[PDB]
Coordinates of C-alpha atoms and ligand atoms in Angstrom, one line a residue:
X1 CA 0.0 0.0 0.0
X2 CA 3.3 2.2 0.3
X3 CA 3.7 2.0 -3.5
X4 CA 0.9 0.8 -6.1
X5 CA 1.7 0.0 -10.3
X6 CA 4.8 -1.2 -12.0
X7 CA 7.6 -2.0 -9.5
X8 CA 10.0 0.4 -9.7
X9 CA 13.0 -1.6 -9.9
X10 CA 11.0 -2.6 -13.6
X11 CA 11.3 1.2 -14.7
X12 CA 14.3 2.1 -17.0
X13 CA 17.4 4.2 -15.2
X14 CA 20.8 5.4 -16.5
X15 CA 23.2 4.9 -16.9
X16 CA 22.0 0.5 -17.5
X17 CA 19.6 1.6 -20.5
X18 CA 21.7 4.5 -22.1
X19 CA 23.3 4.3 -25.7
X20 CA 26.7 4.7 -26.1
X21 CA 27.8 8.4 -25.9
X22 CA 29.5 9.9 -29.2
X23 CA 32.4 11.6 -29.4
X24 CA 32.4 14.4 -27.2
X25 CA 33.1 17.3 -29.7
X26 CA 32.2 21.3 -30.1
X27 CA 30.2 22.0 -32.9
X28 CA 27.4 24.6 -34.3
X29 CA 24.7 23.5 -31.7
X30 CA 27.4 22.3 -28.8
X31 CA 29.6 24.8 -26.6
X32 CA 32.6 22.2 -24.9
X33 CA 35.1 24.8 -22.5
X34 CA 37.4 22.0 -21.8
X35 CA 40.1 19.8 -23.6
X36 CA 38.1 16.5 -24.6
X37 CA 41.4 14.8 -26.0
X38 CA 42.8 15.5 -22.3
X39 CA 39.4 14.2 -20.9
X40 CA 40.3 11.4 -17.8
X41 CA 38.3 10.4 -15.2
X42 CA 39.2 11.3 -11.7
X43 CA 41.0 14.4 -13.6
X44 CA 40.8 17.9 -13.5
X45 CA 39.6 19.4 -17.0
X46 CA 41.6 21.3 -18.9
X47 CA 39.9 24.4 -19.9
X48 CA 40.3 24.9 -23.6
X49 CA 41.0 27.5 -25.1
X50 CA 44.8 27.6 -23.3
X51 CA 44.8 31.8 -23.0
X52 CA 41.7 33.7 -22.0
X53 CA 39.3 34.5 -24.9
X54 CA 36.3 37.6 -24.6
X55 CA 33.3 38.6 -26.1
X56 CA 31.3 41.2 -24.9
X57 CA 28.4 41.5 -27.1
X58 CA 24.6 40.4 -26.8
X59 CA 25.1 36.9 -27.5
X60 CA 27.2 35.6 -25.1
X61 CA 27.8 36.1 -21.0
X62 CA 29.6 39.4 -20.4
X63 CA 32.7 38.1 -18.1
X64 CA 33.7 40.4 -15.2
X65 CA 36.7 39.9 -16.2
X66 CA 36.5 41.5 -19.4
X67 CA 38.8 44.4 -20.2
X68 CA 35.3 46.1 -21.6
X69 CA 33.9 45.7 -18.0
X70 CA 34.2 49.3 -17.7
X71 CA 32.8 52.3 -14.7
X72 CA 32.7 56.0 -15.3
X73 CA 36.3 54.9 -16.8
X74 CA 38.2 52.6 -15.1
X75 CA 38.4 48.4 -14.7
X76 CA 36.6 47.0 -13.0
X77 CA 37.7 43.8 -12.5
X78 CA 41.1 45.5 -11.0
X79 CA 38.5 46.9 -9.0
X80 CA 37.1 43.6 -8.0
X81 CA 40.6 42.5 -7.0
X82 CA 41.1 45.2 -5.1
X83 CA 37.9 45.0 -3.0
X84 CA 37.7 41.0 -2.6
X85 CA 42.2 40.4 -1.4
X86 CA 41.6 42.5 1.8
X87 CA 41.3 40.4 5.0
X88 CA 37.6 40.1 6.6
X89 CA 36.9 39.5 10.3
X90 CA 33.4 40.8 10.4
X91 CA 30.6 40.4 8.0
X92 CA 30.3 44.4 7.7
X93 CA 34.0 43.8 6.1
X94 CA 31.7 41.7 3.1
X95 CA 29.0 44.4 2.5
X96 CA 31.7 47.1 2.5
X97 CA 33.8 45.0 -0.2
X98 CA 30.8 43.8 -2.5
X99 CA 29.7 47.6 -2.5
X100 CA 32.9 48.7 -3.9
X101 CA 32.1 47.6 -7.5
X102 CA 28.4 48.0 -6.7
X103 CA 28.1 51.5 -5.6
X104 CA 25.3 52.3 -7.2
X105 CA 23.5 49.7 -5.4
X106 CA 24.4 50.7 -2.1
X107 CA 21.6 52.3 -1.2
X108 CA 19.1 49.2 -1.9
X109 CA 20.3 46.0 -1.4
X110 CA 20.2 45.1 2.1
X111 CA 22.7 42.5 3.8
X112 CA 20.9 41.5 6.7
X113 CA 20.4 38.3 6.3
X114 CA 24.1 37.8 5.7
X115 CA 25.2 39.8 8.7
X116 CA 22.5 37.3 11.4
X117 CA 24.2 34.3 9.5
X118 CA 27.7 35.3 10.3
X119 CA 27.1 37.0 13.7
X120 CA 23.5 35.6 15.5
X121 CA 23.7 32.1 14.0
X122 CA 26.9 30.8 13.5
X123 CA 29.1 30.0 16.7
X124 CA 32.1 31.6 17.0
X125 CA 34.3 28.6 15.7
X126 CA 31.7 28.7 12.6
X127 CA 32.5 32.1 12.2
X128 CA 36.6 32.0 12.1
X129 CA 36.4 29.3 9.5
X130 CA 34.1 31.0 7.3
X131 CA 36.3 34.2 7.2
X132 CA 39.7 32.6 8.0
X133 CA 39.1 29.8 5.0
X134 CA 35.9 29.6 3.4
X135 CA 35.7 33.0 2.4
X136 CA 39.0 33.4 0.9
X137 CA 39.4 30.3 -0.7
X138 CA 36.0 31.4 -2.1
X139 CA 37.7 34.7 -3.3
X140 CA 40.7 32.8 -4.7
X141 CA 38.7 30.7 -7.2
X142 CA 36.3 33.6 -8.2
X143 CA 39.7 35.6 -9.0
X144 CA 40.8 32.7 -11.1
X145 CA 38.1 33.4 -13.5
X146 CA 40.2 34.3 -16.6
X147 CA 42.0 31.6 -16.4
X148 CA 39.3 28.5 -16.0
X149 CA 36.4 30.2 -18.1
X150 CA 38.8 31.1 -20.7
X151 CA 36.1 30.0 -23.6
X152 CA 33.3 33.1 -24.1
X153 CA 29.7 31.2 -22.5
X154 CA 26.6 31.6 -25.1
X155 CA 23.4 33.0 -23.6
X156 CA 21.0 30.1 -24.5
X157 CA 18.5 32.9 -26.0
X158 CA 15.1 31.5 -26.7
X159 CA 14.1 29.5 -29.8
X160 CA 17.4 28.3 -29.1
X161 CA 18.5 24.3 -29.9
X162 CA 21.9 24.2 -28.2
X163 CA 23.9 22.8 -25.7
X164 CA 27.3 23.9 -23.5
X165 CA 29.2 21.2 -21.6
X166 CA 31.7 22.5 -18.9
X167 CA 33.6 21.3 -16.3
X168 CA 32.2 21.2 -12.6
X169 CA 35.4 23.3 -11.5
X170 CA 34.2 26.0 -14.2
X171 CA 30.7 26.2 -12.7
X172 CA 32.3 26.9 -8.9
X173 CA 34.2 30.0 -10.2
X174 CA 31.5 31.3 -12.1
X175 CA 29.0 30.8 -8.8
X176 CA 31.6 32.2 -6.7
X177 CA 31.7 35.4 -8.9
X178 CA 28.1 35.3 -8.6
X179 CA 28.3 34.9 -4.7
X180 CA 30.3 38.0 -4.2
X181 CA 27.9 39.7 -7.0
X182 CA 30.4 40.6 -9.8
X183 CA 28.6 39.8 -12.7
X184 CA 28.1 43.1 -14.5
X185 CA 24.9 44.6 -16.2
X186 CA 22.8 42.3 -14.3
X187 CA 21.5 44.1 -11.5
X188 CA 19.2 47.1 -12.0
X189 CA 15.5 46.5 -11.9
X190 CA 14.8 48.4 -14.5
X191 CA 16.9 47.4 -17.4
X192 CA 16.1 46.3 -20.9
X193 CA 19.4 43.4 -22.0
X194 CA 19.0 40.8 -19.4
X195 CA 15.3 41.7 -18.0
X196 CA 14.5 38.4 -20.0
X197 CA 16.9 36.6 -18.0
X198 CA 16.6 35.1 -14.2
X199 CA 18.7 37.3 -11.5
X200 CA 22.3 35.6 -11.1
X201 CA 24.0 37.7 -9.0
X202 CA 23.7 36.7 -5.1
X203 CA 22.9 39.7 -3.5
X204 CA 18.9 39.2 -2.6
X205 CA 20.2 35.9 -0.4
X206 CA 22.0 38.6 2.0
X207 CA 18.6 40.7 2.3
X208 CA 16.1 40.2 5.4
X209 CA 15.5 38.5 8.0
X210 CA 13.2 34.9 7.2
X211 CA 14.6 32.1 9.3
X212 CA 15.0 30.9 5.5
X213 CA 17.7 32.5 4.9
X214 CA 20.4 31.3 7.0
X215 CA 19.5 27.6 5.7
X216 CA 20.2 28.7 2.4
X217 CA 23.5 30.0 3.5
X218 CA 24.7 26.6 5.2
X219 CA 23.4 24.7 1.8
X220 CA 25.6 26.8 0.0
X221 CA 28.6 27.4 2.0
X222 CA 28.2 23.1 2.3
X223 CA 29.0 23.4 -1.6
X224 CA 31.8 26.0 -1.7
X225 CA 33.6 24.3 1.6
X226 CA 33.5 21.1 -1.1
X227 CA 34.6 22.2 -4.2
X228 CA 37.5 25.0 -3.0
X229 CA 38.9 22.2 -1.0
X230 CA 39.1 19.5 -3.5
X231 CA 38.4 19.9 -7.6
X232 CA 35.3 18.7 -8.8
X233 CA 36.6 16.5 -11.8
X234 CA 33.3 16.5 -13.8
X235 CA 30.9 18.1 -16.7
X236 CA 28.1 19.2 -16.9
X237 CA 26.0 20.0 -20.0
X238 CA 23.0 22.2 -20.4
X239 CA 20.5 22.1 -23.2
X240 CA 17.8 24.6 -24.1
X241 CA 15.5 22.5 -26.5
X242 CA 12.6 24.2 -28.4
X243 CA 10.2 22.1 -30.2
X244 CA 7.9 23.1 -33.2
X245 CA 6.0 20.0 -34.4
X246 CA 3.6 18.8 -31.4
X247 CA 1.2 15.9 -31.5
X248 CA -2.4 16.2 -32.6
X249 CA -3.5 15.5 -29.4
X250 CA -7.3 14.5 -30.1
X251 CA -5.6 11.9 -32.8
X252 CA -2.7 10.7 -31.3
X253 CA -3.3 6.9 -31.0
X254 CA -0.5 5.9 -29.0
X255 CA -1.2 3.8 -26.0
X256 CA -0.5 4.6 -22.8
X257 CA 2.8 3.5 -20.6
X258 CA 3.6 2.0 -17.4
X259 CA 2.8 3.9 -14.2
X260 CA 4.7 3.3 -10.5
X261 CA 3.2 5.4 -7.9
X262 CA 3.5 6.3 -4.5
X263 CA 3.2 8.7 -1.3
X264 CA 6.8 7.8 0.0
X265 CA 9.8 9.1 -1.3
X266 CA 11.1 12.1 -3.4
X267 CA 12.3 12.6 -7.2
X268 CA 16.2 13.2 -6.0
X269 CA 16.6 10.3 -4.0
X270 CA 14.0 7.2 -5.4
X271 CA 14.3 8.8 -9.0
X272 CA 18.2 7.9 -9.6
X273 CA 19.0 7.6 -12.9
X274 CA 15.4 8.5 -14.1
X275 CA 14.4 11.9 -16.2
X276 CA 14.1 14.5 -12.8
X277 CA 11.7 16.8 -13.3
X278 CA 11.8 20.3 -11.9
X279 CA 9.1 21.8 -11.0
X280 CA 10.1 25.3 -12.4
X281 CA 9.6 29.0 -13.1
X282 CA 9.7 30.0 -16.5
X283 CA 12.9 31.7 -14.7
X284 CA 14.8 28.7 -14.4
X285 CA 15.7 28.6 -10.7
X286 CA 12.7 30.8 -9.4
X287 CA 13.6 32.2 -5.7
X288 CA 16.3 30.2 -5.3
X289 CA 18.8 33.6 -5.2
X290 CA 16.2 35.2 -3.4
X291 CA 13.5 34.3 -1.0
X292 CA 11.5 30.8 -2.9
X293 CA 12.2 27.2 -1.4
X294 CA 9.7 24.9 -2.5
X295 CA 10.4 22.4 -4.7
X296 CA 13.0 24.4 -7.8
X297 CA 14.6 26.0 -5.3
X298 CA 15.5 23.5 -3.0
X299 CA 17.1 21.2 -5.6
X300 CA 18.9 24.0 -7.3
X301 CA 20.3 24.1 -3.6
X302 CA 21.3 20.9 -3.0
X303 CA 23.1 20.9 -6.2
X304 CA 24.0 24.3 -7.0
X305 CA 25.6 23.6 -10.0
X306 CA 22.0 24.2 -11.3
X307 CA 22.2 28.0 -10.0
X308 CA 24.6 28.5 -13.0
X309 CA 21.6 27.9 -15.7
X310 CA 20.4 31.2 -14.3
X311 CA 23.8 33.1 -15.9
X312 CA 23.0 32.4 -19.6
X313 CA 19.4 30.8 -19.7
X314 CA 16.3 33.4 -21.3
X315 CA 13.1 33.0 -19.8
X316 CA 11.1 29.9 -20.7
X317 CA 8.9 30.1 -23.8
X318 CA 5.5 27.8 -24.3
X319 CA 7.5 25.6 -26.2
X320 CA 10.9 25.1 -24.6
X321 CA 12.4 23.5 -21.9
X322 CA 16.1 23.3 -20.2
X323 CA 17.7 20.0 -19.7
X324 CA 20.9 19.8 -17.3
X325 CA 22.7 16.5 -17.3
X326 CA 25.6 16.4 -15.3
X327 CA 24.9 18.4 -11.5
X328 CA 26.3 16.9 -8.2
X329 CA 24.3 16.6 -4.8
X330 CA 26.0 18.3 -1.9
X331 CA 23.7 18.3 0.4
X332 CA 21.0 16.6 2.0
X333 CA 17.8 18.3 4.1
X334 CA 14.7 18.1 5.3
X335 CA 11.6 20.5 5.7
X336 CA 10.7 22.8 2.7
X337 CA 9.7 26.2 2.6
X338 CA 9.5 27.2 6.2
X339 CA 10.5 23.6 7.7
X340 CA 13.3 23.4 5.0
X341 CA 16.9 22.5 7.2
X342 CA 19.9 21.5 5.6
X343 CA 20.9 18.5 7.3
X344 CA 24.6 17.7 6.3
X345 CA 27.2 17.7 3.4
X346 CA 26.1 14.6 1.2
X347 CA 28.6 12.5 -1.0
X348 CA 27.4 12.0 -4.7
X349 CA 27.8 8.2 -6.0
X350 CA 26.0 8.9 -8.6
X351 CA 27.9 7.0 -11.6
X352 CA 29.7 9.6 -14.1
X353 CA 29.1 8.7 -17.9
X354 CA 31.1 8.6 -20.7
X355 CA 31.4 12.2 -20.5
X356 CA 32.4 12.2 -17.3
X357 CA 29.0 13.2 -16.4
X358 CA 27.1 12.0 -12.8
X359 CA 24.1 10.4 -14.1
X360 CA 21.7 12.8 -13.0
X361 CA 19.6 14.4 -15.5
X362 CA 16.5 17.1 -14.9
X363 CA 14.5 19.1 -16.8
X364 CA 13.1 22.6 -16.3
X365 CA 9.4 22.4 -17.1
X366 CA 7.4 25.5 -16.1
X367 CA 3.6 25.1 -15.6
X368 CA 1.0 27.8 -16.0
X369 CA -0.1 29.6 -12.8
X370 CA -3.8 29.9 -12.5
X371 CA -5.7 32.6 -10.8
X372 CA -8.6 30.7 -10.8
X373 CA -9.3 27.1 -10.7
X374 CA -11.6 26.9 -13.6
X375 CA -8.9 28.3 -16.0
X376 CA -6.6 25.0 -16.5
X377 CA -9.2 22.8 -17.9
X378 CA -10.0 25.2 -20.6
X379 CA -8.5 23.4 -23.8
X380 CA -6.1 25.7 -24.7
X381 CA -4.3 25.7 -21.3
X382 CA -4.6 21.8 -21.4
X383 CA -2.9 21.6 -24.6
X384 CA -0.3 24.1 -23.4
X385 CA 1.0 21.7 -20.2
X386 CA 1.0 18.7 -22.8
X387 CA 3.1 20.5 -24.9
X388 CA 5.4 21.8 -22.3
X389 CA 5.7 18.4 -20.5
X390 CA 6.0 16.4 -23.8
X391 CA 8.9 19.2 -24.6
X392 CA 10.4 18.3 -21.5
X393 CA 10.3 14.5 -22.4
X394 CA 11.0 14.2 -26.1
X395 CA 14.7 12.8 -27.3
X396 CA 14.9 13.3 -30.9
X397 CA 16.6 10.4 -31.8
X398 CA 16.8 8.4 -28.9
X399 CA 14.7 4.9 -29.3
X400 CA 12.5 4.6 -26.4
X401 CA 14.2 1.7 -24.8
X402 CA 17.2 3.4 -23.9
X403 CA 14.9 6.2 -22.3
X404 CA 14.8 6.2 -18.5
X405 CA 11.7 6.8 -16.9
X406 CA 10.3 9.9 -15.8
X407 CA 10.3 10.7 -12.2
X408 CA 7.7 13.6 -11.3
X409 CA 5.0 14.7 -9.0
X410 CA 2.1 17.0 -8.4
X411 CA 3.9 19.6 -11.2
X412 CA 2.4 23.4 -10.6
X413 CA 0.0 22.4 -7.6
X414 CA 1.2 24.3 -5.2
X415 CA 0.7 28.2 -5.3
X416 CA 0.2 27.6 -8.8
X417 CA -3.2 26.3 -8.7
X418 CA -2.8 23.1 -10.6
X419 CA -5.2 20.0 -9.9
X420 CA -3.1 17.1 -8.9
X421 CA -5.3 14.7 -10.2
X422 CA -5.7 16.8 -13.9
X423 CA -1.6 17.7 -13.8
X424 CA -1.1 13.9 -13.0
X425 CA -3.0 12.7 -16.1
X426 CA -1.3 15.3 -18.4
X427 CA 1.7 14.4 -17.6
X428 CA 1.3 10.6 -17.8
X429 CA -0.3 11.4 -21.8
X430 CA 3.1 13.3 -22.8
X431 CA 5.0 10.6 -21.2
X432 CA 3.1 8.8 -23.5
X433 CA 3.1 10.7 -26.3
X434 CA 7.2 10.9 -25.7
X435 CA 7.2 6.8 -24.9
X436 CA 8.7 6.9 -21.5
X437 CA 7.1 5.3 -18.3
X438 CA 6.3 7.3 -15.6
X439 CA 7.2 7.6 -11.6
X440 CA 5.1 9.5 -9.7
X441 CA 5.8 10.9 -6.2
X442 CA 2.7 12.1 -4.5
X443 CA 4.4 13.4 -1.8
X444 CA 2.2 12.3 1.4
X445 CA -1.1 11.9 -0.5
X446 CA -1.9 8.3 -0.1
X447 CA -5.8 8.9 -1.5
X448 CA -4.1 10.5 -4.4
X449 CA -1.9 7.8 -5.5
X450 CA -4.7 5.7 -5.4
X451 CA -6.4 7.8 -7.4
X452 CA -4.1 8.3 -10.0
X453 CA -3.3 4.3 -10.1
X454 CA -7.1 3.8 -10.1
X455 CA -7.7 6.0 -13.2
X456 CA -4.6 4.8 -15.0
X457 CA -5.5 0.7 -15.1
X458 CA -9.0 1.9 -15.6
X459 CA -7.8 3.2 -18.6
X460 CA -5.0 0.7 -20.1
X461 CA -7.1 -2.1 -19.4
X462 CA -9.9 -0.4 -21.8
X463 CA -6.8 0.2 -24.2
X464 CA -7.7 4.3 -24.1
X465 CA -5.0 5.6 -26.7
X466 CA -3.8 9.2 -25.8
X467 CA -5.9 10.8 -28.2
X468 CA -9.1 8.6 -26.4
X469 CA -7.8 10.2 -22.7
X470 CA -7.6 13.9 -24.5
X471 CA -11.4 14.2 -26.1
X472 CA -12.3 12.9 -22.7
X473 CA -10.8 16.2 -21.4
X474 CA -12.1 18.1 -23.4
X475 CA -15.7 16.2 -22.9
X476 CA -15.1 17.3 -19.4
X477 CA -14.1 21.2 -20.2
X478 CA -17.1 21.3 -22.2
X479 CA -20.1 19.8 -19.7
X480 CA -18.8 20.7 -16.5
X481 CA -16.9 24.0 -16.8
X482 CA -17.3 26.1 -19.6
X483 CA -20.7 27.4 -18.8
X484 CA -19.7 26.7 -14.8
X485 CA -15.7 25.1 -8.8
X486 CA -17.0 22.0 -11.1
X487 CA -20.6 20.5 -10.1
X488 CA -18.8 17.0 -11.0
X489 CA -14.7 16.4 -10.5
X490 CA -12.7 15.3 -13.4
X491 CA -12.0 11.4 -12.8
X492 CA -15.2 10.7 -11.6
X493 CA -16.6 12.1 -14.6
X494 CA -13.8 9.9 -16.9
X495 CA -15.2 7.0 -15.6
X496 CA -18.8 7.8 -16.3
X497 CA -18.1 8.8 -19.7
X498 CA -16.2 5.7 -20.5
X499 CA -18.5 3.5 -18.4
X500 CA -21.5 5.1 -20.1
Ligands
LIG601 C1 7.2 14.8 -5.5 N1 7.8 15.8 -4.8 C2 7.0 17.0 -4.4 O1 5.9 17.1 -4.7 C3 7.8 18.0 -3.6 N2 7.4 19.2 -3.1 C4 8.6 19.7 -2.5 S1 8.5 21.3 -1.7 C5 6.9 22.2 -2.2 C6 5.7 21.4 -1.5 N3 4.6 20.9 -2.5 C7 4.7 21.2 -3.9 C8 3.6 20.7 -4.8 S2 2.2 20.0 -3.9 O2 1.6 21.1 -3.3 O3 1.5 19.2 -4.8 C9 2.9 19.0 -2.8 C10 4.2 19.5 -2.1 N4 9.6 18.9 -2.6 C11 9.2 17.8 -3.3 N5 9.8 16.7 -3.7 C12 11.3 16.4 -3.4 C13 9.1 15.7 -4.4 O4 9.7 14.6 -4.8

């Protein structure tokens, strides 16, 4: 009764049902910043090029280190330098150097949240390490920056097909930069390049005073303690995919595929190996910089290597998603949103591919937020979350037997307004649609995995194709909410109408 459906152990993981890798290699559609021909497990990449290379343009990350990183003009990445290699002993020592290179900022962001961490919740042994090690270790590797990123970053811009593999040790001195706020023109509220991008910059975690806060702060600090000490020796690749052919829904005659479900568990732990779905802002990331920590946030947390997405990935169109294969888990907690704790520093077995790559792969999908509950079973919204999940699911190319399963939940039911029951059949039809089984975490909700398993062997055993399932929504929409909260809920209905 703890689980109901396919064993899980039946489901398809990576890295057992993957297809060999290719060759690593850049190309038009694929970023690599590292030497693939000096590629070695249980190495340190090689960045390649050897010598810093910039652009500053509006294609591509603009580097703090870039000699065109200018202020009214002077360098400011000598500036940076300057501000960070001075000794701190107090947190106002922090503020004071972050503000040196943000002065026009220094009379809005607020650093209190940073200042309790170091001086009302740390003890005073905490403390000394943080500023005696962590801190400046964390300044070393940020300063290092022209010699580990030295291969310009593309903004994945939308309508984008296009991947960038780096190396784990890249992605710590880019969030490190981002941790001490360096990353230029992508601060003011009001600004036209970058307002389609998420914030990247850390400076809204050091603002007020949520007990939230300082859990962040140990999550993260858990992650730069790690990789300052000791090299991550991995990749990580990010791909922005943006489809333009979707199913006819209504005609799609595929049948549907296997369902495990259950009310224990979570995606990051019982989903190894399987497609992790994120439960995301069309920001990629959401709050996670800032105040959020439900379910985005706290996995972009516990494997902050996600945080970087925020640097070069636009906003989220209908029909795109972002797929990161590759990130580490450094932490574990418990709790979420006010509850949320970090527990302790976590060590990753995930197996690494044949890119050197943990096998851990999630995709961004972003649902719709509903201001009222009626909205999401009008057709064009259904269709939209379809799209967007089959997006998220779809492999061009990939044969569906070496396709993991997909490990979800109750996707956009939170503040959102999604119904779990409706979200849950959506996303079991794209999985469908995209041939992959499905494992569903309801989180607690015993009645609703019930529910879902109920509906789905009610449905296979009548051998319901997808396009069957779909006019049955839309039968819904049509007889119980368009000329409407619903007189009639949506699986009870299902049954009636198939029954009938
Ligand atoms: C399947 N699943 C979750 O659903 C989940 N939620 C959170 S934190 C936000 C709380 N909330 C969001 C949607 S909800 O309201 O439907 C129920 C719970 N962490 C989660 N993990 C690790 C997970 O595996």
């Amino acid at each position: 009764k703890k689980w109901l459906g396919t064993p899980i152990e039946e489901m398809r993981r990576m890295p057992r049902c993957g297809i060999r890798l290719p060759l690593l290699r850049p190309s038009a559609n694929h970023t690599v910043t590292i030497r693939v021909d000096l590629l070695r497990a249980g190495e340190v990449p090689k960045p390649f090029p050897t010598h810093y290379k910039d652009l500053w343009d509006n294609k591509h990350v603009k580097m703090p280190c870039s000699e065109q990183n200018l202020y009214p003009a002077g360098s400011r990445w000598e500036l940076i330098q300057t501000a960070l290699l001075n000794k701190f002993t107090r947190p106002q020592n922090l503020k004071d150097a972050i503000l040196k290179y943000n002065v026009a900022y220094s009379k809005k962001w607020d650093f209190t949240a940073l200042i309790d961490f170091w001086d009302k919740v740390l003890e005073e042994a905490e403390a000394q390490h943080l500023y005696q090690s962590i801190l400046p270790d964390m300044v070393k590797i940020a300063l290092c920056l022209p010699n580990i990123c030295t291969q310009p970053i593309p903004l994945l811009a939308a309508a984008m097909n296009h991947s960038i593999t780096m190396s784990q040790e890249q992605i710590a001195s880019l969030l490190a930069n981002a941790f001490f706020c360096t990353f230029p023109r992508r601060n003011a509220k009001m600004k036209s390049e970058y307002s389609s991008y998420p914030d990247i910059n850390f400076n809204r975690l050091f603002e007020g005073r949520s007990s939230r806060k300082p859990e962040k702060l140990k999550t993260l600090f858990c992650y730069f303690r790690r990789v300052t000490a000791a090299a991550p020796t991995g990749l990580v690749t990010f791909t922005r995919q943006s489809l333009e052919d979707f199913p006819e829904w209504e005609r799609c005659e595929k049948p549907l595929t296997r369902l495990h479900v259950t009310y224990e568990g979570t995606i990051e732990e019982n989903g190894q190996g399987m497609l992790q779905v994120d439960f995301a802002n069309r920001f990629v990331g959401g709050g996670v910089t800032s105040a959020g920590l439900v379910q985005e946030e706290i996995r972009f947390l516990i494997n902050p290597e996600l945080i970087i997405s925020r640097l070069f990935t636009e906003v989220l169109d209908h029909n795109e998603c972002l797929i990161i294969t590759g990130t580490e888990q450094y932490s574990e907690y418990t709790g979420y949103a006010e509850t949320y704790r970090w527990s302790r520093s976590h060590e990753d077995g995930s197996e690494r591919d044949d890119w050197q790559r943990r096998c851990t792969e999630i995709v961004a999908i972003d649902a719709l937020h509903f201001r009222r509950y009626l909205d999401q079973f009008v057709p064009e919204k259904m269709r939209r979350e379809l799209n967007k999940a089959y997006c998220g699911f779809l492999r061009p190319g990939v044969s569906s037997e070496n396709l993991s399963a997909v490990a979800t939940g109750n996707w956009g039911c939170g503040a959102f307004g999604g119904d779990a029951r409706l979200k849950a059949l959506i996303q079991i039809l794209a999985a469908a649609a995209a041939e992959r089984d499905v494992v569903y975490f309801t989180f607690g909700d015993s009645e609703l995995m019930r529910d879902i398993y109920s509906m789905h062997i009610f449905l296979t055993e009548r051998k319901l194709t997808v396009g069957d399932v779909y006019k049955l929504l839309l039968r819904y929409y049509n007889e119980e909410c368009r000329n409407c909260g619903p007189d009639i809920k949506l699986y009870p209905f299902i049954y009636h109408a198939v029954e009938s």
